[PDB]
Amino acid sequence: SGFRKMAFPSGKVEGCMVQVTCTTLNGLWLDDVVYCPRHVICMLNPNYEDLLIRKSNHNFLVQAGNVQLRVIGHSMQNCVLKLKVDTANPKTPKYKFVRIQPGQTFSVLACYNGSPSGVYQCAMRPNFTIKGSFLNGSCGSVGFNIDYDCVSFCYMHHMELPTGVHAGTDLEGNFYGPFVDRQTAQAAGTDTTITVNVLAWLYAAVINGDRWFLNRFTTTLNDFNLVAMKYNYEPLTQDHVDILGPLSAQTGIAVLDMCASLKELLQNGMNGRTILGSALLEDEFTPFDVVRQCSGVTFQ
Amino acid sequence: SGFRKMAFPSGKVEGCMVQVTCTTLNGLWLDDVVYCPRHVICMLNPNYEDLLIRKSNHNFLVQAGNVQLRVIGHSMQNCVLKLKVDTANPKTPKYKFVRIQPGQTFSVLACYNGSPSGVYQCAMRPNFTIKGSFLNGSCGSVGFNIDYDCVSFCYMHHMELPTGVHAGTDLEGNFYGPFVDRQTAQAAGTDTTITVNVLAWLYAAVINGDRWFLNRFTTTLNDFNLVAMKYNYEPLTQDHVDILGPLSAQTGIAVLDMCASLKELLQNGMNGRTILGSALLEDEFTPFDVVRQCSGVTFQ
Ligand SMILES: *[C@H](O)[C@H](C[C@@H]1CCNC1=O)NC(=O)[C@H](CC1CCCCC1)NC(=O)[C@@H](NC(=O)OCc1ccccc1)[C@@H](C)OC(C)(C)C
Ligand SMILES: *[C@H](O)[C@H](C[C@@H]1CCNC1=O)NC(=O)[C@H](CC1CCCCC1)NC(=O)[C@@H](NC(=O)OCc1ccccc1)[C@@H](C)OC(C)(C)C
């Protein structure tokens, strides 16, 4: 028992990280292609089209530890640069490129100089930013889930916005949110709490023996949303009630009974008490994350 | 910028994990030896001495993915079993065996069936437990730090105590705390807050722009301890003031001024406000952890 913010093991992604110099940042070496942010080639308003067809293959140096990989092509796709290289990565995992939704979680492998430095669990926020830990040289760090032996790549790091929050692309080079890879003043809007994830984490607490917040009440979905939206929580949808069904059956607690417990917690506060050792209601675990951590792991 | 509970990248430890069956749990394959909990051979009060010299090498099966490693010797050291095998692990990292102190942090790679399932950051608690996430079959999961290219192994998982907290050994098979590998009623005592780590994390907050808790006051070490010990914080020692020196110089905030800010926070509470997005003062980052995350990572 116990519940922790757990990342995926990072070894499959570590063997894909390389350095790209044109600026220095990180690239993802899969098959015979290295993917990295196009901004490696720049700043207030660049035209990447020009700067790209203007480079040769010898104007990108790609380092896989000490080994120079020879660039034999360069293409752009959206905000991602693809460098074709002479050698297929012998440590290419089975992988997919996925675009995630706000509320979904993933692991970040933060890299510098093509070298892994740390791993942590993030969520795509409703305002399409992530609250990461990234410094100068982290661009090209990736986000991923593992499903069986399969790495699902969902995020590539491009920029920090004011207020210490992070923006980036899917691996097809498409930004999450309405941000652009230019050094004009952008800002993420006000964020929202991920209601479904908070309920998932209240179920994890009950599975782990932490029951004090349960009450004898029930609520309707509309009465629940009437309270939650006052505290800047996303409205709970029928589809969110449905994906909580498995955690509901496992625990014997109806989703709308857990809603009633969460309603009381928002209106009365915690009274200095904690849940799974937190004084705030956590929103960075999905229903799937709870089930993986509480049972799914034993089948590894 | 940004500050997250960051684990070390786990790839170097993933290539050392194997399954051991005699009971099934995890082993650590370094050089020609597999290390795992001796309790793999059991329950209320076993004598391991007997059960050990009573097994042959064919009574331990060691699986490295699909590959059977042949056992050619078995020795016991404290609460750890060492299985000598015919083959040196070709993915043995540069490594040390270290015993950590209460207050120090490490990464856990939680494994099932010899296969990695997740990574998270833990601290050795003053009561010599860890607050982990471990289920049936997790024994033999390890804790580690990385220093340069060098894995420092500090923890092997053996048991869960009541209240959902975890106990284990160093890699010489020596328990952290006064626990034994027998199924007699044991309990960890009341725990303590790691004062030095809370100050380290208040420095991380200031580095990351979160300044609202700073005040104009100072305190002596004795007046600070007089308050902190009322809130079940460890007394701050001169040695703890010394190891905060670098974070002090970087930020221009004197350690005893940060003590005065922490004093006010303990007596007045946060007023529902947060620091680095937490409503509790966090104690699971050391001074070193702060410096690694805020700058040290760029030199990877
Ligand atoms: C990749 O290594 C880095 C990662 C950054 C470094 C600091 N923290 C990170 O996550 N990426 C950058 O440094 C990028 C690079 C530019 C991106 C587009 C064009 C090519 C260069 N820059 C930033 O991330 C800046 N963000 C930004 O410019 O946002 C728009 C903006 C401009 C002016 C006012 C407000 C907003 C960062 C470095 O700037 C701030 C810290 C001021 C947000
Ligand atoms: C290794 O795979 C597992 C890991 C456990 C599984 C559940 N969570 C974990 O972290 N280890 C165990 O299952 C061990 C194995 C025994 C250890 C010593 C002798 C050989 C078998 N058992 C436990 O971890 C139990 N803890 C325990 O027995 O503590 C002493 C005790 C006894 C009676 C009352 C109070 C305390 C767990 C499974 O028991 C409790 C969950 C009741 C604490």
Swiss-Prot record, chains A, B:
Give the Cytoplasmic membrane side ranges.
1-300
Residues shown, of full length: 3264 to 3569 of 7096
Q: What is this protein called?
A: 3C-like proteinase nsp5
- Main function: Cleaves the C-terminus of replicase polyprotein at 11 sites. Recognizes substrates containing the core sequence [ILMVF]-Q-|-[SGACN]. Cleaves and inactivates human TRMT1, preventing tRNA guanine(26)-dimethylation of tRNAs. May cleave human NLRP1 in lung epithelial cells, thereby activating the NLRP1 inflammasome pathway. May cleave human GSDMD, triggering alternative GSDME-mediated epithelial cell death upon activation of the NLRP1 inflammasome, which may enhance the release interleukins 1B, 6, 16 and 18. Also able to bind an ADP-ribose-1''-phosphate (ADRP).
Q: Where is the active site?
A: H39, C139
Under catalytic activity, the entry for this protein gives: TSAVLQ-|-SGFRK-NH2 and SGVTFQ-|-GKFKK the two peptides corresponding to the two self-cleavage sites of the SARS 3C-like proteinase are the two most reactive peptide substrates. The enzyme exhibits a strong preference for substrates containing Gln at P1 position and Leu at P2 position
Q: Any idea where this protein resides?
A: Host cytoplasm; Host Golgi apparatus; Host nucleus
Q: Where is the Peptidase C30 domain?
A: 1-300
Organism name = Severe acute respiratory syndrome coronavirus 2 (2019-nCoV)
